[PDB]
């Protein structure tokens, strides 16, 4: 029996790709269909060899090879919408590569994925990656605090947030990491109470905390 007929009735969720190293890759799109396809190949009701690939798993696997053979590289994400010609989003304002070694990298990345035929490398701009991250964080009316340093920005969302400001701040981060990756810009949601809870303090460059009506505490300038 064939592999596309050994899976379930709905032959729409899985996609069988003929590998080049005499194998056969099945491409699921979440972790529940990955275990649905791995149970068939693990109970052993198929003769030849086959593997189950994914989006997040294969994008985590190829960064271990790239963190050894190409360190200090500024990239974002590998996109697998068409699993035969994947797109590699590379940074523009941070690399020192000419047109020759980009073809060398596009051939060594092709040798890592036997199901693909050609790897397309497109150079995404570096400022719009934080411009979309700030403009999407302002439409949800969320308080935030941007920190700029070289090779990555950081948005801190703290304080006592209500239940609408947690549910709105989670659906945006999970919709942004899905299309940009967590390599460049990092969100830091941190639900905690207010510092100096019921204490009156005298802020700014010469500070104290009133522990009581007759008790002064002198820590760091609040």
């Amino acid at each position: 029996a064939e592999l596309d007929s050994l899976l379930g009735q709905e032959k729409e969720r899985f996609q069988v790709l003929p590998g080049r190293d005499k194998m056969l890759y099945v491409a699921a799109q979440n972790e529940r269909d990955t275990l649905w396809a791995r149970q068939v190949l693990a109970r052993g009701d198929y003769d030849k060899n086959a593997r189950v690939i994914n989006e997040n798993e294969e994008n985590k696997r190829i960064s271990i090879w790239l963190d050894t053979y190409y360190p200090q590289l500024a990239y974002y994400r590998i996109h697998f919408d068409e699993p035969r010609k994947p797109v590699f989003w590379l940074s523009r304002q941070r690399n020192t590569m000419s047109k020759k070694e980009l073809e060398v990298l596009s051939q060594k990345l092709r040798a890592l994925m036997p199901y693909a035929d050609s790897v397309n490398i497109t150079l995404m701009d570096d400022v719009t990656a934080a411009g979309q991250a700030e403009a999407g964080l302002k439409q949800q009316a969320l308080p935030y605090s941007r920190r700029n340093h070289k090779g990555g920005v950081t948005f801190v969302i703290q304080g006592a947030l209500d239940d609408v400001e947690i549910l709105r701040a989670r659906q945006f981060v999970d919709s942004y990491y899905r299309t940009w990756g967590g390599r460049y810009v990092q969100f830091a949601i941190e639900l905690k109470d207010d510092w100096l809870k019921g204490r009156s303090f005298q802020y700014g460059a010469e500070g104290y905390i009133k522990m009581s009506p007759g008790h002064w505490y002198f820590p760091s300038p609040l």
Binding site: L35, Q39, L167, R168
Partner: protein
């Protein structure tokens, strides 16, 4: 053909089957009359079915409630026991009333218990509520959080909008296709 669980009841067996069937293994429920049900799987699916029994903590234990620790059959009943049997029937009636809304499939409400305010001359504290919910998918579940807050605010003496926490989520993907018998 190998058995992995016997003696289960009806509600336990229908939640062991519903867990195994989404992980592409097929189970068989066998009645035995007085001794309860029993669940048997095939021979290639035994190593995986034991792993999901261990991971998912199956069979499910019965759900506990505060009103069971203080039964009404005792000859004497302390006021701590009468207040504990009152708040545990209010938080059951509130979650049975949340399922009659538009789109809610399951819910779970918790109330803060105050028992020591009545024994001595201390004033009582404010009362806190917390809810969970599971919604039908396709629903805008960001604006569904204001109706559960408005419903929960004046079902007690005096609460605020800062003492109510609602955490709700859409339901999982539907499982409709058969698992598949292993060929040999």
């Amino acid at each position: 053909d190998k058995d992995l669980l016997k003696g289960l009841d009806q509600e336990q067996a229908n939640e062991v089957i519903a867990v195994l069937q989404m992980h592409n293994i097929e189970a068989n429920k066998i009645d035995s009359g007085k001794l309860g049900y029993s669940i048997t799987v095939a021979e290639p699916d035994f190593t995986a079915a034991v792993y999901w029994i261990k991971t998912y903590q199956l069979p499910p234990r019965p759900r506990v409630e505060i009103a069971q620790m203080f039964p009404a059959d005792s000859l004497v009943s302390s006021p701590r026991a009468e207040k504990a049997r009152l708040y545990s029937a209010i938080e059951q009636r509130l979650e049975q009333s949340l399922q009659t809304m538009e789109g809610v499939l399951s819910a779970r409400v918790h109330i803060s218990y105050d028992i020591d305010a009545g024994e001595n001359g201390r004033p009582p504290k404010p009362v806190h509520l917390s809810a969970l919910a599971v919604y039908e998918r396709g629903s805008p579940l960001a604006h569904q959080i204001s109706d559960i807050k408005r419903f929960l605010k004046n079902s007690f003496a005096d609460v605020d909008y800062d003492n109510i926490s609602v955490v709700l989520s859409e339901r999982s993907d539907a499982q409709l296709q058969a698992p598949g018998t292993p060929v040999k």
